[PDB]
Structures are given as structure tokens and as C-alpha cells.
Symmetry: C3
């Protein structure tokens, strides 16, 4: 974990974000149970009957939050890991990881909590900024070593 | 690959799971062809006409299995890789990877095979357990190096 | 970045592909705005009224392209990284990464541009070939170190 000074901070933030995705998965399951809205007939038949194989807006919302996480957090897992080894300024790297962590936690709160627009959109944008920054830095480092 | 004693086992299990996801992708395509259920008008027009741009429950099921894989296997690729470098007991690490591999293969069989509830849900839970375990271990290691 | 001769090429191609996924995300948002097709009532109410919380075929197409990217590019991020450290022939490794990069960029163009079948399907197949190749190579290396 001490292979680079920024690595511990990266691993802390990334792992917290993975756990945060698992929290969304757990919430999704609980909403399915509460609202009796199952994706599969085999699930529905165990939990009240075939009529409960149905869509639900809250389930769909949970799935959107989880999908958006997959569209954003998974790239961060890659970019942040590589970036940790490019010798960035420790504080600067910290700030990249923290902005992503805070932005993404806020995104899930804004999504699942149905907060007014443009709160969710702003949190998404905030979090994407350090990702764009790391991506460009990796490009320069990779290109110059070709 | 010998950068850590647990790494070969991790790389074997992870790569098998990636191949298992590709198998789901291949099955999905075959179901689309068999059931004539295409997502795109350009596909449908090559394969019988515009009426074949349509949803199908078996195609949707394949997509759910693939999506669930993305929600679970992708985090494992990250967590398991990092965990391999934290000096875990070789046998203990093996067990983490094997439980995930077996649980996830069983999950796909239970999903695509339409096995009775709660078989699929149990396989998902089984496989998530070693992921939660690795995530916590990474948190402790990262935090203590800050 | 010089931990292995193939690594710079891998990091260049992978990071470009992550940026290419972000481009799809940006396009998706712009299509939502242009076509007034929002996934969430809170978005719709800021942008003209509740009737604009609705699906749209172009938005759905963008989401399919992005999802297909998640089904294919994310595995490449893992496989290509590991493969970079297995001492492959530099030119051979380059070719694996370039075929994936070109195939995937072409895939997005074919998907979003609604090009005739089987153009998109062929680009997908082309790009999967080096992934299958790397996966098998990782399997052999991992297995022989057990
Ligand atoms: C900077 C970056 C780097 C890497 C990847 C993506 C991006 C990136 C690119 C673009 C955007 C990006 C693009 C449109 C954006 C925004 C951000 C924001 C914050 C708004 C809301 C505003 C502030 C106008 C408001 O409502 O007042 N719009 C309009 C909008 C609103 C709803 C929907 Cl569904 C789609 C589009 C956000 C990003 F994170
Ligand atoms: C432990 C862990 C670590 C990390 C991430 C997630 C989790 C995790 C957390 C919670 C669960 C978790 C939550 C509800 C669960 C289960 C597991 C299981 C196995 C059941 C079925 C039972 C056994 C009751 C039955 O039917 O008899 N329920 C109820 C249920 C059933 C169907 C649907 Cl769609 C949603 C919820 C599964 C997990 F893997
Ligand atoms: C080789 C590999 C390695 C790893 C993972 C997957 C794969 C992999 C496996 C299979 C395929 C794979 C499977 C069916 C394929 C193709 C490739 C191609 C190119 C076609 C179009 C043809 C050429 C027949 C035409 O239309 O003339 N079909 C038929 C088809 C068409 C549309 C839909 Cl929705 C589903 C299936 C593509 C792959 F990339
Ligand atoms: C990481 C997981 C974050 C979970 C954030 C959940 C925010 C829940 O927020 C709640 O949402 C309800 C309906 O959506 C509203 O009725 C409540 O007013 C609101 O408190
Ligand atoms: C990694 C890929 C695993 C593929 C597992 C596929 C299991 C197929 O299982 C089959 O499913 C059919 C319909 O779903 C049933 O009619 C059959 O009884 C059953 O054998
Ligand atoms: C990485 C992002 C790639 C973007 C490729 C977008 C290709 C757009 O292609 C355009 O699509 C329109 C409708 O789909 C058609 O009407 C136009 O003829 C076509 O030029
Ligand atoms: N897949 C996204 C691509 C763009 C994006 O990520 N937008 C942000 C800010 S508006 C978001 O939170 N999207 C909601 C979602 O993905 O469900 C979408 O459909 O909107
Ligand atoms: N996205 C999941 C989150 C929870 C989850 O992964 N549940 C397991 C056990 S019930 C599952 O197999 N879900 C089916 C699916 O994701 O389609 C869901 O909608 O259910
Ligand atoms: N999830 C894919 C699995 C197979 C696949 O990736 N097919 C390629 C070639 S036909 C594709 O471009 N699929 C379109 C898509 O995923 O939306 C599907 O539903 O088709
Ligand atoms: C998409 C808008 C976000 C801009 C990200 C800024 O990212 C910055 O880019 C500079 C030039 O590449 C780099 O020198 C710098 O290290 C990086 O932080
Ligand atoms: C979510 C329920 C799964 C529990 C995972 C247990 O995980 C365990 O956690 C302990 C305390 O952090 C660790 O000491 C131990 O290494 C780890 O295997
Ligand atoms: C799914 C069809 C794609 C085939 C990928 C070919 O992949 C090849 O496999 C050989 C045998 O494992 C390896 O010796 C070779 O390094 C690899 O490039």
C-alpha cells in the first residue's frame, strides 16, 4: 500500500465507494420487497403471486443510481489507481480523490432522496472533474513513454 | 504474477469470471437471434423485418444476469487485486476467491436456468460475503497507512 | 509507467477508451435535453413540465451504447493491465490494444450513427478477439504459477 504516497488515500476512497455501491444494491433489494416489485416470476411467486412481477418507479430509480455509479465509479477505480503511481503532489491527489468521494456520495443522496434539480446533475459534474483531470495526466505520461 | 502468493489464484478466478461474463454476452446474442428480438431497427431489418425490433422476456433475463455480473464481478476485480497484495493467508485468500467464483457461476446458472427462489438470491449473498470481507480488510490497511 | 514495455501503450489506449465512454455520457445528456426526454420527474419539472419525464428512442440508443461499453471496455481495463505484465511481445501487445481501441471507437460510431447491420456487430466481434486472446494468456500464466 506504500508503493506510492497517494495510494493509501486512493484505496480508502475507492473502497468506500465500492461499499457505497453495495449499499445501493441493498437498498434496491429492500425497495423490491417493500413495494413488492420483482424482476422475475420466480421471485414474485415466492413473495405473494405473479402480479408482483412488475416494474416500480422507486426500484427503477435505485437501478438508475446504481447504473450511474457503474458509469462513473468504475472508471475512477482504474484512473485513480494508475494516477496514484504517476508521482502526483500528495495533497493535490488527496483533493482529486476527496472531491470524487464527496461528489459521488452526494450524488446517491440527491438521486435516491429525489432532491430538486439541478442538485444531482451538479454533484455528478463535480465528481467528473477530477476524473477528467486524472485521465489527461495519464494520457501525457503514457504518451511520453511511447 | 508472483508479486504475491495469492495473486495467481486471484488472476485465475477473475479471468474465469470475465470469460463467464462473455459467455452471458454470447448467450444473449443467440437468444436475440432465436427469439427474433432485437434492440435496434437496423438489426431487425436484416433479420426479418421491423416487427422484430422488440423486447423479449428471455433477452431481458439475459441482460439482467449480465447487469448483475457488472454490479458484482467488476467490484471483485478491483477488491481481489488489491487484497492479493495485503499479505493475506494463502489458503484464506484462496477461499475468498473460490467462494466468489463458485457463488457467481451458480448465480448465472440459477438466473438463466430460472431456478426456484431463493436459490439465485442465496448464491448472490454467498458471493458478496468474501467481497465485504476483502473491502473491510482494504479499509483497515489503507486507513493505517494514512 | 515503464514497469513493463507494453504498459505505456495499454495506458494510452485504455485512457482514450475511458474518455470515449465519457463522450457517450455527454452525448446522452445532450440528447435528453434536445429531445426533452428525462428519466426523473425532478429533471422534467425544471425543463418544461412533467410530460417530459419520458423515454426516447435516441436516449435509449445512447444508453445501449454506454451499456455495451461497460460490458466490453471494463473487462479490457482489467485484462489489458494484467496482460501488460506477462512479458508479451511489444508489437503483438500493441496490436491487441490497437485492435480493441479501433474496434470500440468504430462500435460507438456504428451504434450512435445507426449504421446498417452487420457493421456494429462486426466491430464488436473484432474488438472482442484481442480480449479473448489476453484472457487465455492470463489463464495459462496464472494456472502455471499455482
Ligand atoms: C466535465 C466532464 C468531464 C468528464 C466527463 C464528463 C464531464 C461533464 C460534461 C458535461 C456535464 C453537464 C452537461 C449538461 C448539464 C450539466 C452538466 C448540468 C449540471 C446541467 C444543469 C444546469 C446547470 C444547466 C441547470 O439545470 O441549471 N446541465 C444540463 C442538463 C440537465 C439535465 C440533464 Cl438530464 C442533462 C443536461 C457534466 C459533466 F460532468
Ligand atoms: C452481505 C453483503 C455484503 C456486501 C454486499 C451485500 C451484502 C448483502 C446484503 C443483503 C442481502 C440479502 C437481502 C435480502 C435477502 C437476501 C439477501 C436473501 C437471500 C433473501 C431471500 C430469503 C432468504 C429471505 C428467502 O426468500 O427465504 N432476501 C430477501 C429478498 C428476496 C428477493 C429480493 Cl428481489 C430481494 C430481497 C444479500 C447480500 F449479499
Ligand atoms: C470471439 C469472442 C470472444 C470473446 C467474447 C465474445 C466473442 C464473440 C462471440 C460471438 C460473436 C457473434 C455472434 C453472432 C453474430 C456475430 C458475432 C456477428 C458479427 C453476427 C452477424 C452476421 C455476421 C452473422 C451477419 O449479420 O451477417 N452474428 C449474428 C447476430 C446478429 C445480430 C445479433 Cl443482435 C445477434 C447475433 C461475437 C463475439 F465477439
Ligand atoms: C449511500 C446511500 C444513500 C441513501 C440516501 C437515501 C436518501 C433518502 O431520503 C429520503 O427519500 C425519501 C423518498 O426518496 C423522501 O420521502 C424523504 O424525504 C428523504 O428523507
Ligand atoms: C455461464 C453460463 C451458464 C448457463 C446456464 C444456462 C442454464 C440453462 O438451463 C435451462 O434453462 C431453460 C430455460 O431457461 C430450461 O427450460 C431448462 O430446464 C434448463 O435446463
Ligand atoms: C465517440 C462518439 C462517437 C459519436 C458518433 C456519432 C455519429 C453520428 O452520426 C450521425 O447520426 C445521425 C443520427 O444518429 C444521422 O442522422 C447522421 O446521418 C449521422 O452523421
Ligand atoms: N447515463 C447518463 C449519462 C449522463 C449522466 O451521467 N448524467 C448525470 C447528471 S444529469 C446523471 O445523474 N444521470 C442520471 C442517470 O444516469 O440515471 C444519463 O442517462 O443521464
Ligand atoms: N440490481 C439488483 C440489486 C440487488 C441484487 O443484486 N440482488 C440479487 C439477489 S435477489 C439479484 O440476483 N438480483 C437480480 C438482478 O440484479 O437482476 C436488483 O435489482 O435486485
Ligand atoms: N448485451 C449485448 C450482448 C451481446 C453484444 O454485445 N452484442 C453486440 C453485437 S450485436 C452489440 O453491439 N450489442 C448491442 C447492445 O449491447 O446494445 C446485447 O444485448 O446484444
Ligand atoms: C473537462 C474539464 C476538466 C479539465 C481537467 C483539468 O485537468 C488538468 O489538465 C491539465 C492539462 O492537461 C494538467 O496539466 C493538469 O495536471 C490537470 O489537473
Ligand atoms: C457484511 C457481512 C460480512 C462480514 C465480513 C467479515 O470480514 C472480516 O471482517 C473482520 C473485521 O473487519 C476482519 O478482521 C477479517 O479479516 C474479515 O475477514
Ligand atoms: C474466441 C476466439 C479467439 C481466440 C483467441 C486466440 O488467442 C491465442 O490463444 C492461444 C492459445 O491459448 C495463445 O497461445 C495465444 O497467445 C493467444 O493469442
Amino acid at each position: 500500500v506504500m508503493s506510492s504516497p497517494a495510494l493509501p488515500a486512493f484505496l480508502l476512497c475507492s473502497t468506500l465507494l465500492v461499499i457505497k455501491m453495495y449499499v445501493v444494491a441493498i437498498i434496491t433489494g429492500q425497495v423490491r420487497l417493500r413495494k413488492k416489485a420483482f424482476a422475475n416470476p420466480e421471485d414474485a411467486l415466492r413473495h405473494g403471486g405473479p402480479q408482483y412481477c412488475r416494474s416500480d418507479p422507486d426500484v427503477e430509480r435505485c437501478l438508475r443510481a446504481h447504473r450511474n455509479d457503474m458509469e462513473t465509479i468504475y472508471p475512477f477505480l482504474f484512473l485513480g489507481f494508475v494516477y496514484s503511481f504517476l508521482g502526483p503532489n500528495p495533497f493535490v491527489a488527496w483533493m482529486h480523490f476527496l472531491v470524487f468521494l464527496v461528489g459521488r456520495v452526494a450524488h446517491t443522496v440527491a438521486y435516491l432522496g429525489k432532491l430538486r434539480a439541478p442538485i444531482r446533475s451538479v454533484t455528478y459534474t463535480l465528481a467528473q472533474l477530477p476524473c477528467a483531470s486524472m485521465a489527461l495526466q495519464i494520457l501525457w505520461e503514457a504518451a511520453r513513454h511511447l
